[PDB]
Amino acid sequence: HAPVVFTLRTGIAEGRMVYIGVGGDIDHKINPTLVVHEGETVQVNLVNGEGAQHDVVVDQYAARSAIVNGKNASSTFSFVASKVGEFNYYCSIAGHRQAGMEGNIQVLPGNRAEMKSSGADITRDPADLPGPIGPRQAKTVRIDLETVEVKGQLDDNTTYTYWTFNGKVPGPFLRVRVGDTVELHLKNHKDSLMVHSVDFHGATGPGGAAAFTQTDPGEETVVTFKALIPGIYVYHCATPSVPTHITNGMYGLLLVEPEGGLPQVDREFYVMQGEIYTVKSFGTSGEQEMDYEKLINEKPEYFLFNGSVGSLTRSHPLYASVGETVRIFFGVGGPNFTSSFHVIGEIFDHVYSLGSVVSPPLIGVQTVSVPPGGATIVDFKIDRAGRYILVDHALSRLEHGLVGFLNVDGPKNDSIMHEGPA
Amino acid sequence: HAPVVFTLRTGIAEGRMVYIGVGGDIDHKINPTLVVHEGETVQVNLVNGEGAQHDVVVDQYAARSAIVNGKNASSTFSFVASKVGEFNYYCSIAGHRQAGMEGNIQVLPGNRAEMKSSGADITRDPADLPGPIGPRQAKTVRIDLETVEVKGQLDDNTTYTYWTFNGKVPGPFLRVRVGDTVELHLKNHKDSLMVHSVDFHGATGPGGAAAFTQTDPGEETVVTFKALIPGIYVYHCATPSVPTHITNGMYGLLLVEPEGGLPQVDREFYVMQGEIYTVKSFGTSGEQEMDYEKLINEKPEYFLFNGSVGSLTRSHPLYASVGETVRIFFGVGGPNFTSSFHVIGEIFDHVYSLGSVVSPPLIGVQTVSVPPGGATIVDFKIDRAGRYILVDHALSRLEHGLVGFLNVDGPKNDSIMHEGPA
Ligand SMILES: [Cu+2]
Ligand SMILES: [Cu+2]
Ligand SMILES: [Cu+2]
Ligand SMILES: [Cu+2]
Ligand SMILES: [Cu+2]
Ligand SMILES: [Cu+2]
Ligand SMILES: [K+]
Ligand SMILES: [K+]
């Protein structure tokens, strides 16, 4: 899947010079055992804790970090765990392994267990959206939203109180045609602590409907509005604190299609990016809580596609076939960060700049900047097989949970790309 | 002389696990060279700084500390530096010597250089007192005292602002007879910042004379008083802050002889103990300053015989001959600590309890408690040769500067004490 990441700081613990695990299953453990599965790419982050000179060397794998001299100095490295077995990792600096700097890597056969937690699955499946609208004239379309607060799985062994539309993140993908009148019914579940509401960027008028949809727990609110302008629009809860309702999960997409629909495509996907601001650092397991200082000061701990870590890699990856033309509806709930959306190994044939559906799309684009509260549409033909990788190209975000897979079967080598010379 | 003491704390410095010097000529130096002279007793104090397991081993002397496990854990040890040359000291814990824990001891030939500093010598020679008074009739005795503030030598390469009677610590030994009338002329030097005065414990009347002797810089004060009761009395400055004037050096002894005089003795000595409360720890060099918090909370850094570190060891030890009956007039200026006065290798034949010169002295006593603002007289016959050692037997004080020598020349072995069986 994605690399398994372990973080080690050096220091003095239990009477010796040692490595100490940070986060995951190794948190605060001295010389922790790093357990890994055959064929995984293993990444190790070494951070210098006390200021002596260190490295990490993996015995038999020829893998090592750079040497790290001062306090905080850091070195990151990886290796493919291709041989089952036990392998020491140790510091090669004179005396250090003897002083105590040594632990084990266990390469186990088989595949890593699925992620588990005591929380609900809150992920939107990227194939979970309505298809192109049929050959219909304009009508009144009824849409139902329900606002629900739920303990959700954020990561392996890690949970969070999400606030959602209809129990998943992003909310339901709404699809209407320009000229439609939308009759929106918003129920706020009676267990909710908060009032919830909705602001559609595709709606015209007070709060984009928020003025009409502030709904108490157990109540229902109804609003009707005309869809006047085609485009791909974000919607989100708009009860103060708005950035808090958004970071907790309350965002979704609304497509107002042009009269004759968007160009036809073999397959469509639904993806949104957001942030979560937890008291504890990324990778720390257990029950997570919002940290308001991190929220207001724009210091995220998690960056997420569709609600959770591994949402689009392990739980609900994207799948297509070679020769298919694919469309991604991509939006940023945020609340704060502009995404530099890229599919590793592919090129966008068409990009609907700033989510404009009326203007001609741009042609042949690697990466598209998408602001919080903004959406685009990207289309591309898949020419050949591979695992394509959805990322925000601010690539430090990879290591905060932001990565998605698009799986396409077929041969490794072909005329489009192959090993060896031409 | 006394042992030469080196303190080493363990830590991470300059990128390695090392020893770091504390105080003396080695302060903050990584793996300091400990320079020593042939025949010196070398004491090494090891304090664990960071919490890894440590010792110190001295390579060819086979002297070592105990192992020290947690932060602050300490071990102290010594060896006689009997061979000239260069010797490694190192940590024997696996990996630590390679990690950086090693330095040198240089044993040099010859004798350690004399103590020096930019300060004046403020020490009172312990032979510097008037001898027994005649068989006179009572009379009027004129005493002159001058109060001077002077930068004095506190230790090798270390200085302090002393406040003194007549430029030394303790002030002059005053010696009169019961029935005498003392006419005191107290001059306060014109460069003094402070007013100074004097309170005599052998004086009867307001402030022990202090009400008559508050003396401005540049001025003189004169007071006449009767000496009504024989005894050995402390006197000291009595200007607020009194414990401040006392700690800075303003204390002395006044002997009021009984009518018949004290028992005749071959030799008499003058010794007083006091404390100094410096901002930096004992053993740190440079210009020292008074720390008021340490003074008022009774946390001394220096404990001193006659003014200074090495006053009665290197500067002017006591000297006597075998078979002499010797008398020490011993007083405690303080300001705060009770002394447990003891001469190692000898026994007090007579102790004048609480400074009483009228009651029969106690017989055959090892150690005498002498409160601050109190004095005694001890007499003993010196039966054989040796270096006798004046101590406050609260023996941690040895390391805060409190030690004197009484040097008696002659054969090491005799019928009173000798090596080997009887
Ligand atoms: Cu190391
Ligand atoms: Cu809400
Ligand atoms: Cu908005
Ligand atoms: Cu050590
Ligand atoms: Cu004074
Ligand atoms: Cu007094
Ligand atoms: K393509
Ligand atoms: K004796």
mmCIF file with all atom_site columns, N, CA and C in Angstrom, chain A residues 12 14-17 50-53 69 94-96 98-100, chain B residues 12 14-17 50-53 69 94-96 98-100:
data_model
loop_
_atom_site.group_PDB
_atom_site.id
_atom_site.type_symbol
_atom_site.label_atom_id
_atom_site.label_alt_id
_atom_site.label_comp_id
_atom_site.label_asym_id
_atom_site.label_entity_id
_atom_site.label_seq_id
_atom_site.pdbx_PDB_ins_code
_atom_site.Cartn_x
_atom_site.Cartn_y
_atom_site.Cartn_z
_atom_site.occupancy
_atom_site.B_iso_or_equiv
_atom_site.pdbx_formal_charge
_atom_site.auth_seq_id
_atom_site.auth_comp_id
_atom_site.auth_asym_id
_atom_site.auth_atom_id
_atom_site.pdbx_PDB_model_num
ATOM 1  N N  . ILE A 1 12  ? 18.193 9.305  26.118 1.00 0.00 ? 12  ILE A N  1
ATOM 2  C CA . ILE A 1 12  ? 18.674 8.504  27.230 1.00 0.00 ? 12  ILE A CA 1
ATOM 3  C C  . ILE A 1 12  ? 17.406 8.063  27.867 1.00 0.00 ? 12  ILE A C  1
ATOM 4  N N  . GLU A 1 14  ? 15.789 4.604  30.389 1.00 0.00 ? 14  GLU A N  1
ATOM 5  C CA . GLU A 1 14  ? 15.999 3.374  31.144 1.00 0.00 ? 14  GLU A CA 1
ATOM 6  C C  . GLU A 1 14  ? 17.465 3.134  31.348 1.00 0.00 ? 14  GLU A C  1
ATOM 7  N N  . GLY A 1 15  ? 18.179 4.203  31.652 1.00 0.00 ? 15  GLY A N  1
ATOM 8  C CA . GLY A 1 15  ? 19.589 4.095  31.992 1.00 0.00 ? 15  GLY A CA 1
ATOM 9  C C  . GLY A 1 15  ? 20.587 3.893  30.868 1.00 0.00 ? 15  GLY A C  1
ATOM 10 N N  . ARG A 1 16  ? 20.172 4.000  29.592 1.00 0.00 ? 16  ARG A N  1
ATOM 11 C CA . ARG A 1 16  ? 21.069 3.795  28.415 1.00 0.00 ? 16  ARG A CA 1
ATOM 12 C C  . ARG A 1 16  ? 20.861 4.844  27.329 1.00 0.00 ? 16  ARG A C  1
ATOM 13 N N  . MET A 1 17  ? 21.802 4.906  26.402 1.00 0.00 ? 17  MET A N  1
ATOM 14 C CA . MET A 1 17  ? 21.587 5.616  25.145 1.00 0.00 ? 17  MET A CA 1
ATOM 15 C C  . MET A 1 17  ? 20.819 4.709  24.162 1.00 0.00 ? 17  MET A C  1
ATOM 16 N N  . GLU A 1 50  ? 19.071 14.352 21.706 1.00 0.00 ? 50  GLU A N  1
ATOM 17 C CA . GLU A 1 50  ? 19.931 14.874 22.760 1.00 0.00 ? 50  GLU A CA 1
ATOM 18 C C  . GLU A 1 50  ? 21.210 15.519 22.265 1.00 0.00 ? 50  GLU A C  1
ATOM 19 N N  . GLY A 1 51  ? 21.564 15.331 20.993 1.00 0.00 ? 51  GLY A N  1
ATOM 20 C CA . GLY A 1 51  ? 22.673 16.094 20.442 1.00 0.00 ? 51  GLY A CA 1
ATOM 21 C C  . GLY A 1 51  ? 23.986 15.359 20.278 1.00 0.00 ? 51  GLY A C  1
ATOM 22 N N  . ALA A 1 52  ? 24.025 14.067 20.583 1.00 0.00 ? 52  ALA A N  1
ATOM 23 C CA . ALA A 1 52  ? 25.184 13.274 20.180 1.00 0.00 ? 52  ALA A CA 1
ATOM 24 C C  . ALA A 1 52  ? 25.021 12.898 18.707 1.00 0.00 ? 52  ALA A C  1
ATOM 25 N N  . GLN A 1 53  ? 26.067 12.370 18.092 1.00 0.00 ? 53  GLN A N  1
ATOM 26 C CA . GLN A 1 53  ? 26.029 12.022 16.678 1.00 0.00 ? 53  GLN A CA 1
ATOM 27 C C  . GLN A 1 53  ? 25.375 10.650 16.481 1.00 0.00 ? 53  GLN A C  1
ATOM 28 N N  . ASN A 1 69  ? 23.702 15.177 13.483 1.00 0.00 ? 69  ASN A N  1
ATOM 29 C CA . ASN A 1 69  ? 24.640 15.749 14.466 1.00 0.00 ? 69  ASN A CA 1
ATOM 30 C C  . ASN A 1 69  ? 24.013 16.544 15.628 1.00 0.00 ? 69  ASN A C  1
ATOM 31 N N  . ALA A 1 94  ? 30.715 5.234  16.821 1.00 0.00 ? 94  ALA A N  1
ATOM 32 C CA . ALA A 1 94  ? 31.606 4.426  17.677 1.00 0.00 ? 94  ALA A CA 1
ATOM 33 C C  . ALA A 1 94  ? 31.057 4.374  19.098 1.00 0.00 ? 94  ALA A C  1
ATOM 34 N N  . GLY A 1 95  ? 30.829 3.152  19.584 1.00 0.00 ? 95  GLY A N  1
ATOM 35 C CA . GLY A 1 95  ? 30.372 2.908  20.954 1.00 0.00 ? 95  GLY A CA 1
ATOM 36 C C  . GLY A 1 95  ? 28.862 2.886  21.122 1.00 0.00 ? 95  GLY A C  1
ATOM 37 N N  . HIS A 1 96  ? 28.127 3.488  20.190 1.00 0.00 ? 96  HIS A N  1
ATOM 38 C CA . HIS A 1 96  ? 26.686 3.689  20.417 1.00 0.00 ? 96  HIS A CA 1
ATOM 39 C C  . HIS A 1 96  ? 25.838 2.433  20.452 1.00 0.00 ? 96  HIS A C  1
ATOM 40 N N  . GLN A 1 98  ? 26.862 -0.535 21.361 1.00 0.00 ? 98  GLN A N  1
ATOM 41 C CA . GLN A 1 98  ? 27.220 -1.084 22.684 1.00 0.00 ? 98  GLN A CA 1
ATOM 42 C C  . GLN A 1 98  ? 26.565 -0.321 23.830 1.00 0.00 ? 98  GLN A C  1
ATOM 43 N N  . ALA A 1 99  ? 26.510 1.015  23.747 1.00 0.00 ? 99  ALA A N  1
ATOM 44 C CA . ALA A 1 99  ? 25.826 1.826  24.756 1.00 0.00 ? 99  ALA A CA 1
ATOM 45 C C  . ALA A 1 99  ? 24.330 1.562  24.818 1.00 0.00 ? 99  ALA A C  1
ATOM 46 N N  . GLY A 1 100 ? 23.750 0.942  23.793 1.00 0.00 ? 100 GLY A N  1
ATOM 47 C CA . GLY A 1 100 ? 22.359 0.547  23.866 1.00 0.00 ? 100 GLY A CA 1
ATOM 48 C C  . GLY A 1 100 ? 21.524 0.828  22.623 1.00 0.00 ? 100 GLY A C  1
ATOM 49 N N  . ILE B 1 12  ? 26.228 15.396 27.327 1.00 0.00 ? 12  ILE B N  1
ATOM 50 C CA . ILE B 1 12  ? 26.421 15.433 25.897 1.00 0.00 ? 12  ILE B CA 1
ATOM 51 C C  . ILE B 1 12  ? 26.888 16.833 25.597 1.00 0.00 ? 12  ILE B C  1
ATOM 52 N N  . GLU B 1 14  ? 29.655 19.150 22.746 1.00 0.00 ? 14  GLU B N  1
ATOM 53 C CA . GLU B 1 14  ? 30.376 19.122 21.470 1.00 0.00 ? 14  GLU B CA 1
ATOM 54 C C  . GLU B 1 14  ? 30.087 17.906 20.611 1.00 0.00 ? 14  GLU B C  1
ATOM 55 N N  . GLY B 1 15  ? 28.862 17.376 20.668 1.00 0.00 ? 15  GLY B N  1
ATOM 56 C CA . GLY B 1 15  ? 28.453 16.248 19.779 1.00 0.00 ? 15  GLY B CA 1
ATOM 57 C C  . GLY B 1 15  ? 28.722 14.825 20.260 1.00 0.00 ? 15  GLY B C  1
ATOM 58 N N  . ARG B 1 16  ? 29.192 14.684 21.501 1.00 0.00 ? 16  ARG B N  1
ATOM 59 C CA . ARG B 1 16  ? 29.601 13.367 22.045 1.00 0.00 ? 16  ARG B CA 1
ATOM 60 C C  . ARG B 1 16  ? 29.132 13.257 23.487 1.00 0.00 ? 16  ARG B C  1
ATOM 61 N N  . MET B 1 17  ? 29.169 12.040 24.007 1.00 0.00 ? 17  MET B N  1
ATOM 62 C CA . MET B 1 17  ? 29.000 11.762 25.427 1.00 0.00 ? 17  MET B CA 1
ATOM 63 C C  . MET B 1 17  ? 30.348 11.935 26.083 1.00 0.00 ? 17  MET B C  1
ATOM 64 N N  . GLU B 1 50  ? 23.079 13.065 32.824 1.00 0.00 ? 50  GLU B N  1
ATOM 65 C CA . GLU B 1 50  ? 21.981 12.822 31.893 1.00 0.00 ? 50  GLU B CA 1
ATOM 66 C C  . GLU B 1 50  ? 21.213 11.521 32.105 1.00 0.00 ? 50  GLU B C  1
ATOM 67 N N  . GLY B 1 51  ? 21.713 10.618 32.945 1.00 0.00 ? 51  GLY B N  1
ATOM 68 C CA . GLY B 1 51  ? 20.964 9.430  33.315 1.00 0.00 ? 51  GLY B CA 1
ATOM 69 C C  . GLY B 1 51  ? 21.396 8.103  32.714 1.00 0.00 ? 51  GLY B C  1
ATOM 70 N N  . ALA B 1 52  ? 22.506 8.096  31.973 1.00 0.00 ? 52  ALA B N  1
ATOM 71 C CA . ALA B 1 52  ? 23.063 6.843  31.457 1.00 0.00 ? 52  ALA B CA 1
ATOM 72 C C  . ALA B 1 52  ? 23.973 6.315  32.555 1.00 0.00 ? 52  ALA B C  1
ATOM 73 N N  . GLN B 1 53  ? 24.348 5.045  32.478 1.00 0.00 ? 53  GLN B N  1
ATOM 74 C CA . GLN B 1 53  ? 25.167 4.456  33.510 1.00 0.00 ? 53  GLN B CA 1
ATOM 75 C C  . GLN B 1 53  ? 26.610 4.900  33.305 1.00 0.00 ? 53  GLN B C  1
ATOM 76 N N  . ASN B 1 69  ? 24.064 5.479  38.349 1.00 0.00 ? 69  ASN B N  1
ATOM 77 C CA . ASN B 1 69  ? 22.998 5.035  37.449 1.00 0.00 ? 69  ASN B CA 1
ATOM 78 C C  . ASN B 1 69  ? 22.049 6.136  36.982 1.00 0.00 ? 69  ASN B C  1
ATOM 79 N N  . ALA B 1 94  ? 30.116 -0.195 28.678 1.00 0.00 ? 94  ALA B N  1
ATOM 80 C CA . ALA B 1 94  ? 30.292 -0.615 27.286 1.00 0.00 ? 94  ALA B CA 1
ATOM 81 C C  . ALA B 1 94  ? 29.950 0.523  26.296 1.00 0.00 ? 94  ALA B C  1
ATOM 82 N N  . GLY B 1 95  ? 30.926 0.889  25.467 1.00 0.00 ? 95  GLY B N  1
ATOM 83 C CA . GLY B 1 95  ? 30.718 1.868  24.409 1.00 0.00 ? 95  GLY B CA 1
ATOM 84 C C  . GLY B 1 95  ? 31.073 3.286  24.799 1.00 0.00 ? 95  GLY B C  1
ATOM 85 N N  . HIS B 1 96  ? 31.039 3.600  26.090 1.00 0.00 ? 96  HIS B N  1
ATOM 86 C CA . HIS B 1 96  ? 31.177 5.003  26.541 1.00 0.00 ? 96  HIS B CA 1
ATOM 87 C C  . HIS B 1 96  ? 32.530 5.608  26.288 1.00 0.00 ? 96  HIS B C  1
ATOM 88 N N  . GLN B 1 98  ? 34.503 4.861  23.842 1.00 0.00 ? 98  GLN B N  1
ATOM 89 C CA . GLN B 1 98  ? 34.505 5.118  22.404 1.00 0.00 ? 98  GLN B CA 1
ATOM 90 C C  . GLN B 1 98  ? 33.580 6.281  22.014 1.00 0.00 ? 98  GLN B C  1
ATOM 91 N N  . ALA B 1 99  ? 32.440 6.381  22.696 1.00 0.00 ? 99  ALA B N  1
ATOM 92 C CA . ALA B 1 99  ? 31.481 7.467  22.518 1.00 0.00 ? 99  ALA B CA 1
ATOM 93 C C  . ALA B 1 99  ? 32.057 8.849  22.901 1.00 0.00 ? 99  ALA B C  1
ATOM 94 N N  . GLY B 1 100 ? 33.153 8.891  23.671 1.00 0.00 ? 100 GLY B N  1
ATOM 95 C CA . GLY B 1 100 ? 33.841 10.142 23.975 1.00 0.00 ? 100 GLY B CA 1
ATOM 96 C C  . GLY B 1 100 ? 34.272 10.308 25.427 1.00 0.00 ? 100 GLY B C  1
#
